[PDB]
Amino acid sequence: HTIFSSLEVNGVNQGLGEGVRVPTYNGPIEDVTSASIACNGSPNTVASTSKVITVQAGTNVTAIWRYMLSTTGDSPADVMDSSHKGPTIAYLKKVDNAATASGVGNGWFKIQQDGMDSSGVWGTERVINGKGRHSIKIPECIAPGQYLLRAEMIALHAASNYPGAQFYMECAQLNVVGGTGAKTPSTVSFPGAYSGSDPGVKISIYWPPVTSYTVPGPSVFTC
Ligand SMILES: *[C@@H]1O[C@H](CO)[C@@H](O[C@@H]2O[C@H](CO)[C@@H](O[C@H]3O[C@H](CO)[C@@H](O)[C@H](O)[C@@H]3O)[C@H](O)[C@H]2NC(C)=O)[C@H](O)[C@H]1NC(C)=O
Ligand SMILES: [Cu+2]
């Protein structure tokens, strides 16, 4: 249970719910076929925001994850419960207007992931123990313009069967400046990219103990 509730750009937090479409409730999405897998949604309620955050291509934004919207601390229990082991992921989607576009459909490409490392430490643990900081590099070679940023943590502690995986995601509204447009990504759809039978979605992380993990979705886009 966790919420991506603010974005940091160049050392500066842009504000709670400012340019990030936040739900009030920190519960997961569980159905990978639901339109809610894109930018959260029903049975949650998601707030709108008219703020679009300007970001320089080639630099990093930081998604800031908190247990609740009211949370003010940054210790592990203020981010997410440490049972919630799994990957962190981030995607971009070019849109005409980042304040009104839904996220649902084709256009997403993956720009960041952190699965399980050699020491069996998971991406989510690095965020939990890293003050909730999920750092994501905006590619330098993409076309400038309006984008949605989808930042995600997947908790796999109850994912032996499907449904079981817990998907925590929110979408931020960006204006990417300075991109060269040198490369055009191949894209996937949400819903569509993840299936219930994917080996990184339906997985027992205890029996046997995992030493390699396949993060779901397409491969990472690089310049
Ligand atoms: C900007 O965002 C980048 C992600 O999109 C991020 O890159 C990642 O940084 C981490 C650590 O800084 C790297 O992780 C590993 O490095 C060594 C082996 O490579 C390990 O010993 C560490 O434990 C750690 O897991 C990621 O590999 C790296 N990913 C990529 C694609 O470069 C940058 O750190 C972010 N930059 C800033 C300034 O925040
Ligand atoms: Cu939870």
Separation between Cα atoms, residue 71 and residue 84, nearest integer Å: 18
Residues 6+ positions from 206 with CB-CB distance below 8 Å: none
- What does each C-alpha distance from 51 to 5, 96, 108, 136 come to in angstroms? 13, 15, 21, 20
Task: Tell me the CA–centroid distance for residue 78 and ligand 2, in Å.
Answer: 12
Separation between Cα atoms, residue 55 and residue 103, nearest integer Å: 19
Q: Determine the distance from the C-alpha atom of residue 96 to the mean position of all C-alpha atoms in its chain, rounded to a whole number.
A: 21
Task: Tell me the CA–centroid distance for residue 25 and ligand 1, in Å.
Answer: 30
Residues 220, 113: contact at Cβ < 8 Å?
Answer: yes
Separation between Cα atoms, residue 28 and residue 153, nearest integer Å: 10
What was the resolution (in A) of this experimentally determined structure?
1.9
Residue that the structure tokens 């069967």 belong to? 161
Residue that the structure tokens 């440490």 belong to? 82
Residues 44, 25: contact at Cβ < 8 Å?
Answer: yes
- DSSP bridge pairs for 133: 64
Q: What are phi and psi of 36, to 5 degrees?
A: -70, -15
Choose which residue among 89, 121, 135 to substitute to test ligand 1 binding: the one with the highest number of ligand atoms within 8 A of its C-beta. 135
Separation between Cα atoms, residue 218 and residue 223, nearest integer Å: 15
Residues 6+ positions from 166 with CB-CB distance below 8 Å: 28, 29, 30, 84, 154, 155, 156, 158, 159
